[PDB]
Design an enzyme around this catalytic site. Sequence first.
Site, PDB file in Angstrom:
ATOM      1  CG  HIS A   1     -76.107  47.902   9.864  1.00  0.00           C
ATOM      2  ND1 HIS A   1     -75.914  48.343  11.154  1.00  0.00           N
ATOM      3  CD2 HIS A   1     -77.447  47.823   9.687  1.00  0.00           C
ATOM      4  CE1 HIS A   1     -77.087  48.504  11.740  1.00  0.00           C
ATOM      5  NE2 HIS A   1     -78.031  48.182  10.877  1.00  0.00           N
TER       6      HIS A   1
ATOM      7  N   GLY B   1     -79.610  50.647  18.866  1.00  0.00           N
ATOM      8  CA  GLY B   1     -79.541  49.265  19.333  1.00  0.00           C
ATOM      9  C   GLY B   1     -80.719  48.390  18.897  1.00  0.00           C
TER      10      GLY B   1
ATOM     11  CB  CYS C   1     -80.334  47.462  13.972  1.00  0.00           C
ATOM     12  SG  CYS C   1     -80.463  49.195  13.433  1.00  0.00           S
TER      13      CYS C   1
END
EC number: 3.4.19.12
Lengths: 305, 305
Positions: free
Chosen positions: A41, A143, A145
């Site tokens: 993603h 942020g 991830c």
Amino acid sequence: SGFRKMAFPSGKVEGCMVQVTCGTTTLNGLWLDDVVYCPRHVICTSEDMLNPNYEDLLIRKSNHNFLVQAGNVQLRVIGHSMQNCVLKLKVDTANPKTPKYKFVRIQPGQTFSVLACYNGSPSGVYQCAMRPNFIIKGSFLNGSCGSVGFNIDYDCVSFCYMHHMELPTGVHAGTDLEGNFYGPFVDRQTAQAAGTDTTITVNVLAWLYAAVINGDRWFLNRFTTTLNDFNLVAMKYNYEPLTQDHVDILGPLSAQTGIAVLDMCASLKELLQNGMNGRTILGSALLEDEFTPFDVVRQCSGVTF
Amino acid sequence: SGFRKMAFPSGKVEGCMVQVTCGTTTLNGLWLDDVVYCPRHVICTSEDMLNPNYEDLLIRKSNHNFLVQAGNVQLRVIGHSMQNCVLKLKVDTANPKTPKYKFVRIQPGQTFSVLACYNGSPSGVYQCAMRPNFIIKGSFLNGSCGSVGFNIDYDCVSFCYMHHMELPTGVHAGTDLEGNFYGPFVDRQTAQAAGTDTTITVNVLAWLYAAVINGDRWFLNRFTTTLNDFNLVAMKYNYEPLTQDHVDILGPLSAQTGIAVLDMCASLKELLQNGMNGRTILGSALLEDEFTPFDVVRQCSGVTF
């Protein structure tokens, strides 16, 4: 003595964290050998996330569209591919700080350390359990991830988790390092819900053993029980059923303490039925289920890495 | 979102841990530049510990009596001296992994990370508070002495704690890095007891702010109070009195949440008077006091290092 929720030393993982940027989206990647692993993603806008076709979105991305930055140094990306829900970015330099590592898909109830990162830089480290309904309850801001979860056995780091999603309920979902989600979750911003949160019974038992070892024994009672009897009670309190394997696993703690597993089960039963009456166990007012039997043994004998 | 007790990434400290051996006693030392810092009780037998004269015991020790081992490599000790309750061993090699560092004497109520080590090798890392009675409640087994506590501000590690003693009560005592004990404790195996354990009120308040930010607000009530009124209540529950400085310190959290500090004090008051009624706040059934206001801000905005 004394007993704490302790993470693994994070140095080996720190040296593998990078920043991955594609378009407007920046998150974290794991740099091992000449490959950077990150959530797929990374390629999505916030609008994309409502209903992404990752194959289609990926078509418009080339090697040069992925900026990989390790501290202040830019890595050259020479190849990329999608594996389930992760991107593997082939870079032209092997990470000189690559530790001995494995990728492992952990079981529900098992614990690991999370190194929370932002823009490829570490923020902090803390211990987690993969819950029976396949979520974790972490601390993950925007942020975060691509932050990873791991265990260490001596010099070998076993990576088990990469953070990908926060669900509407505030719980967290991610994948193993081959990019398969724990549980039924998808990398789309839709209504997904975890099921009933159940307690990891074998872990609660381990923690009670840790307590006794440390001098907290007010909760030891004069009863025993049977697996079936105890489990009837466990069902009602949304505790995972206890099996013979779990009993076997607790054997070393049973032996060290001289308290039969089923006697400890009977102590646990009374605690579920009567609560703690305003008392504490190892400075907790509830039944802690984020220590495995191995975690307890590890701490109580002081295993190093 | 979500909120965890998080330690600082430990890599920078890992690279400074060594093993110090003198006679039969092995423990941990901190190797910074060309100096190894360790507890002076490295020189004691177990019998010595009952009533040591460290000056006399030190007379019989030479440079060559201190074996300093950094991973698998022996360091040459070229000088030694006692500073309060720590030994400084001058070695002939500067640690090539020495980070930017400070030595700081922290205040009661302040928090730090502990990297628990055995034989100079790290075991795990966890967050601690220096309690108002100058003990910490850690996890320290035999051999853990010399393990350090620290904070990081970007690239600079501020060392604040070295572990030296476990008291009869199971609590832990140590020194700053100049070797002065926190509290009245001495490096002798005698009856010493910490005083009354009091809660760090300003920290509990910070944690309540963290809760609200994260969606836990069932505990917000319709009352306010005054500093004096609240403190009367605090006295009874063995909470540290709250001062104007503490209020000032909570200002940014007040502002972010729109809840006046004294309104949060009134919520806290009801919680002390009525308990939680079997409910939880950020997955705790008691009032957590091991987060500073700065810790809360740090986590809730995701500061990295």
